[PDB]
Each structure stands twice: as C-alpha cells, then as structure tokens.
C-alpha cells in the first residue's frame, strides 16, 4: 500500500486513448493532439483476497477528484462502471467494505495490462467501437491495456 | 518582420479549435483534453501588396517545418491551401515569387483576425460549420464565425 501514487496514462491495443469527457470516461483514437487522462494507480491489498488474479489497486481520474467503481445497481442485469466524487487519498484509509467496489486487479502480461474487478469477479474493463465499461467476455485487445508513464 | 516569431492557437469564433490530424489541419471542438496546434507567425512582406488587405504573414505548423499556402495544383475546380515540408525560418527568405503562395493577409477585428491568401486574394481561409472538418479556404461564406478567428497565445 504505497503512499505515493504511480501516475500514468492508459492506452489499448486497437490504437486508442482513454480521456475524461465531461465526467464520463471514454476511449478515442491515439492522435497527437489528444491529452490523455492521467490516472493515479496505487496498491491496496485485500484481506479475504483471491488467487489466480493479479495485484489489487485503486483507480482515479483527474488527479484524484473522481475514482472508479463497479457495483451493479438494481438493475442493469450486469455490473457497470461509474465515477465517484471521492478523493483517492481518502480511499486506501477506509476499511474493506467501502474499498471493495473500487479495487481492481492488474494482471501483468507482456507489455499489456488488464483490470479485473473485485466486487464482481470475472468482470474486466473494456473498450467498444463511446464510453468505457465492463465486460465478462468477448474480445482480446479490448482488455489488454498498455500503461505509458507520464 | 521583427526578430523572433509569434506563437498562438487558432480558435475560430464558433468555439472550435485548430489541431493537426494525420498531416492535415482540422478544426475540432475546443475540449478539456484537446492539444491545440501551436502556430508560428512570421509577418512577411509583398512589394506588390494590396490596399485594405492586412499585414502579410506566412504561417507554420507544428514546430516550424510544414508551412501552409494557397495554390492551384493540377486541374481541379477551385484553389485550396496545403502544407509544404519546409522550415519556417528557411521559407521567409526565399524570393518574393517563392513566398507569394505562403503569404496570408491578416486583418484584425477586435480580438478577432481575418486571413486572406496572397496567391489568390478574395479567397479567405475558413473553417466548416460541422465540428470535425479540415480547415480550408473560401470566397463566399454563410457565417461570420468561420473566417473570424481568435489567436489565443499560450
């Protein structure tokens, strides 16, 4: 659980870039005139954790004024992906119940990365062909992300 | 042409910004993550200049190399502006006949700026109405905010 965030930008393997567009996280092509959204990742272990998957981290956009979670409301049959007006430096200091929907699992592979949820396992982060959502598989490059540093 | 050029971004008065996409200059909505293409203005001169037409200026895109200019290539319908792989410091000295297509007439209007070509005066540089088009040149318009441009320096 690092006190210092590891800032970076997120790309995918269909040549796109993740930016925050009016409070909504979408993926657009990787043109030069795009200022990628800089995310603030940082480790955060889970007590009753799980194997087979990678390292648990938190996620936050725009320095840290908004964070990622995945809860499944009433609702939309599947889980979803929304933002939260909650500072990131306040998150890792909470317990285990409030940290769970915001915890993701970065499974390292090659130059690629992929974020599996924690509250709803088997549900990853994906792009489409247009906002960013979650998936329970059905493609490949829409899950393998390349993290280029700031 | 004073010492050193001027740097700014071409925001048209329809809330779109000027950026360079795949070697072509387009106009996208000025969004909170769009990196506006920084232009380089060196005020040029034309001994056979036209009255009322503003100060002659040649323009460069993305760190000097690549200047814009109006011409009439093979046998098309109308003139059009393009981009030539040439350094801005190098172009400003070549012959008046060589600089002529690259010179543009900048006539300020308050916080705004007109931009008429020197190779083909009467044709003003312009943007489109739908917000995701390449910036071109026109001689008859249908809105003011597409030739009237803001030059916000950063």
UniProtKB/Swiss-Prot annotation, chain A:
Molecular-function annotations in GO: cytokine activity; identical protein binding; interleukin-1 receptor binding
BP-aspect Gene Ontology terms: cellular response to lipopolysaccharide; cytokine-mediated signaling pathway; immune response; inflammatory response; negative regulation of interleukin-6 production; negative regulation of tumor necrosis factor production; regulation of inflammatory response
GO cellular component, one term: extracellular space
Keyword Magnesium among UniProt keywords: no
Effect of residue 125 to T: In IBD31; decreased stability; increased degradation; decreased localization to the nucleus; decreased localization to the extracellular space; decreased function in regulation of inflammatory response
Alphabetic keyword roster: Cytokine, Cytoplasm, Disease variant, Nucleus, Secreted
Conditions for induction: Highly induced by bacterial lipopolysaccharides (LPS) and TGFB1, more moderately by IFNG, IL18, IL1B, TNF and the dinucleotide CpG (at protein level). Constitutive expression in bone marrow macrophages is down-regulated in the presence of IL4 and CSF2. Induced by phorbol myristate acetate (PMA) in different cell lines.
Family: Belongs to the IL-1 family.
The name this protein goes by in its record: Interleukin-37
Native organism: Homo sapiens (Human)
Curated annotation (Swiss-Prot), chain B:
Gene name of this polypeptide: IL37
Recorded GO CC terms: cytosol; extracellular region; extracellular space; intracellular membrane-bounded organelle; nucleoplasm
Recorded family membership: Belongs to the IL-1 family.
Subcellular location: Cytoplasm, Cytosol; Nucleus; Secreted
Main location: cytoplasm
UniProt name for this protein: Interleukin-37
GO molecular function, one term: interleukin-1 receptor binding
Tissue expression notes: In general, low constitutive expression, if any, in healthy tissues; high expression in inflammatory counterparts, including in synovial tissues from individuals with active rheumatoid arthritis. Isoform A, isoform B and isoform C are expressed in testis, colon, placenta, lung and lymph node. Isoform D and isoform E were found only in testis and bone marrow. Whereas only isoform A is found in brain, only isoform B in kidney and only isoform C in heart.
One record GO biological process: cytokine-mediated signaling pathway
Keywords: Cytokine, Cytoplasm, Disease variant, Nucleus, Secreted
Disorder this protein is connected to according to its UniProt record: Inflammatory bowel disease 31, autosomal recessive: A form of inflammatory bowel disease, a chronic, relapsing inflammation of the gastrointestinal tract with a complex etiology and a multifactorial inheritance pattern. It is subdivided into Crohn disease and ulcerative colitis phenotypes. Crohn disease may affect any part of the gastrointestinal tract from the mouth to the anus, but most frequently it involves the terminal ileum and colon. Bowel inflammation is transmural and discontinuous; it may contain granulomas or be associated with intestinal or perianal fistulas.
Portion held of the full protein: 53 to 206 of 218
Record's keyword annotation contains Nucleus: yes
Expression induction: Highly induced by bacterial lipopolysaccharides (LPS) and TGFB1, more moderately by IFNG, IL18, IL1B, TNF and the dinucleotide CpG (at protein level). Constitutive expression in bone marrow macrophages is down-regulated in the presence of IL4 and CSF2. Induced by phorbol myristate acetate (PMA) in different cell lines.
Superkingdom classification of source: Eukaryota
């Amino acid at each position: 659980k690092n006190l210092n965030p590891k800032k970076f930008s997120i790309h995918d393997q269909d040549h796109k870039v993740l930016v925050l567009d009016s409070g909504n996280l979408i993926a657009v092509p990787d043109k030069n005139y795009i200022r990628p959204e800089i995310f603030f990742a940082l480790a955060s272990s889970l007590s009753s954790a799980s194997a087979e998957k990678g390292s648990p981290i938190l996620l936050g956009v725009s320095k840290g004024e908004f964070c990622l979670y995945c809860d499944k409301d009433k609702g939309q049959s599947h889980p979803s992906l929304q933002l939260k007006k909650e500072k990131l430096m306040k998150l890792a200091a909470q317990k285990e119940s409030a940290r769970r929907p915001f915890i993701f699992y970065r499974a390292q592979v090659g130059s690629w990365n992929m974020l599996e949820s924690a509250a709803h396992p088997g549900w990853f982060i994906c792009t489409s062909c247009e906002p960013v959502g979650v998936t329970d598989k059905e493609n490949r490059k829409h899950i393998e992300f390349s993290f280029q540093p700031v």
